[model samples]
Target chain A: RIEDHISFLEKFINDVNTLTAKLLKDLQTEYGISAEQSHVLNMLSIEALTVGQITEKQGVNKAAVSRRVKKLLNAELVKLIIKLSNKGKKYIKERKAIMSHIASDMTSDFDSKEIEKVRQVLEIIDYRIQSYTSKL
Target chain B: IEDHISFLEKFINDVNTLTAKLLKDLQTEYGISAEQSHVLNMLSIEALTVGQITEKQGVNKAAVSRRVKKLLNAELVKLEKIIKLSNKGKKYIKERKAIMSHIASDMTSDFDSKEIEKVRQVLEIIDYRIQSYTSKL
Candidate 1:
């Protein structure tokens, strides 16, 4: 009844807040990125995507994605490339050379494959991203 | 013939900036565990009810009664009865909206107050939808 509703809400809110914070916390600490930024960056790395493309993958707003893209572009963490399909359309790419990575004090030695898994968790991303913007 | 490749120092710095921000921001602004702050935000939107939140968030506490009991003790939030606000709990609900607004701006989006408020409204919508979906479950 109504009793079930109240108890359910309390539990749900606690869990969601906990998870959002967990992911947000991951974004902050995962690689010096916000969770949204990380997703955008990862998707950009997969292929040269426009604000629309990134937004679709991210499940966020177009304006919000655009703002994030602008920030990343300014940070040099991401770069813009023009696509041939539409003369006005530009795509994004991530800069692995400059962006974050695992630790040194990290007694954890990431093997080539383990390290490669980084690319894998974010696979087609680096491959397609590297497709054109490999210069940096 | 390109042999110059280095990702070491960059990785370390990245980790530092990310973690430091996570710990510092969550504590200073939200005033609860990272998990608890997440719970608050999630509640604001209707994307998740408690058990689904558990399923989706993977926030299975080893000892929730202990943790939930602690929050009840702290007057943060309550459980096991029709959840009502203790005075402290009410303040948290208000403060958390501010925090959520702050969080939106902190994102790359330069969400102005109006935009952030819009986001807050959207979060509420998301919360409502999630809540509705859950009642049947």
Candidate 2:
């Protein structure tokens, strides 16, 4: 009887943990982006940061962010604002803004200030992503 | 005539964006041919090694080995040995909290009201799946 009880407890804990991970993962896929990609998009969705800034925040390389940026730019999901203050910029300022508007529907863009705050806060904390992988 | 023109322009542009994203989403979900869902289900039940994953996958060790590694890295289902330490695993947990700060919930876990809803939705569904799908998992 004691052995049987221990077995049941073990199985129950295992079942609960596995189920929690799967559910989080499902929500992640449904959201139409990985937890990582969502973080990058939200950050840029707020204030258009240089590729350098994004790299540090992401803990990834500039090339990876650049590759991601190219896709985001192509989709017209996020607008790029080039800051003239950065002396030796990699991507051009005026050209990027113009190009982004040309590619995307400006009317559908997220509000900059609200989005920036969201970026400052949310992208890193993508709970749906972390909760999924973590509970596993 | 001019007054109506701008609204139409905005409407048409918005449609272009939404439709473009939605179409790809539908196919990727329904179109995945291999039984990744089933395979993933099995892996989730325990800490299986490369060979065990290959056994369930029936694709050979080389084919599935990389995938198992990636899953571990993603913090999805961790290896018992790889994650056991207060050493790396503890940092892994702390680092994750650091990562979470940028999105919907962050550092202090100050989840906004909307954030709570998103979490509830995810948790409920995962609950549903464990009940339905994990018999295989």
Candidate 3:
């Protein structure tokens, strides 16, 4: 059963990554933003976060995060404090809508209870994985 | 509500990023990318055609071809219309598997059997939903 779970987790992670990459590719084609740039925008859409915070959350190195932020800055989509500029806010507002649409379609068949279950399970796994990594 | 959708979207993105990072960390020691490691692992089971790997992995043919090409160049796999792990690949996979299993055990050490089963079941359902949704796109 442990092996089964490991195998399932591996496949599930791969599937989700592939799907996300496809979605991000569409975003890139439409919005002219790379995946990292979009991630920066999305995080800033929430609130101002330091580059270090974004690097940690993104599981990427600081240099990569800095590059993404520099591109967004040049585009005038982001300002100081790593907060979204008016243009960045507008971009994420529209981008969030498209993401929401895709999420809704992907989970449309699941009922409220099933959706809740998924959310809970994912949070548990996420927390455990984070905890495991922190000890290393 | 809209909040739930936002959470789902963000959560998926986070998981994808984390998984990619984890795979890269694990595969770096072997001097292969995660995708190439996956192909070698699959080949360890049985020889498969490029089309088969593409279908099974749910990735594009070109991506699969590229990974296989790299592995071929590394002499980790051999081709005879279908791809099979070379002797070198078998040894490499064996070493990789030991580390993989150890990490897997450590990750799941806190989880009980029932919890794992529940997680696996939910993931299966989620995977099914994704496949159905993507097919329509």
Which predicted model would earn the best lDDT? 3
* TM-score of candidate 2 on Cα atoms, chains taken together: 0.27
Per-residue error (Å), model 3, residue A31: 1.7
Regions of candidate 1 where Cα sits further than 4 Å from its true position: A1-136, B1-31, B43-56, B61-63, B102-137
DockQ, per model, reads 0.04, 0.05, 0.29
The segments of candidate 3 whose C-alpha lies over 4 angstroms from its true place after superposition are A51-53, A56-63, B1-28, B33-70, B77-97, B100-103, B106-112, B115-119
- The alpha-carbon lDDT assigned to residue A92 of candidate 3 equals 76
Mind giving the per-residue lDDT tens digits that candidate 3 earns over A1-136? 4555555665665555456655556655566776657767877777798878887776566687888788888888889867878887777777767667776776677677766766776677666656655653
| Model 3 / residue B19 / CA error / Å | 6.0
Backbone clashes in model 3, listed as residue pairs:
none
**C-alpha-based local distance difference test score of model 2:** 0.39
Candidate 2 chain A, poorest ten consecutive residues by summed lDDT? A82-91
Better of 1 and 2 by lDDT: 1
| Top candidate when judged by TM-score against the true structure | 3
Residue-by-residue lDDT tens digits, candidate 3, B19-131: 55556755676678756877787666568989877756654588788898888888889988878888888777666555556666765677666755665666688787665
Total clashing pairs in model 1: 21
TM-score for all models, in order of appearance: 0.31, 0.27, 0.69
Write one digit per residue (lDDT tens) for candidate 2, span B29-131: 4332122322343443455666545543334355566555544464444656432222333343234223322321223344465753444343344345445
Better of 1 and 3 by TM-score: 3
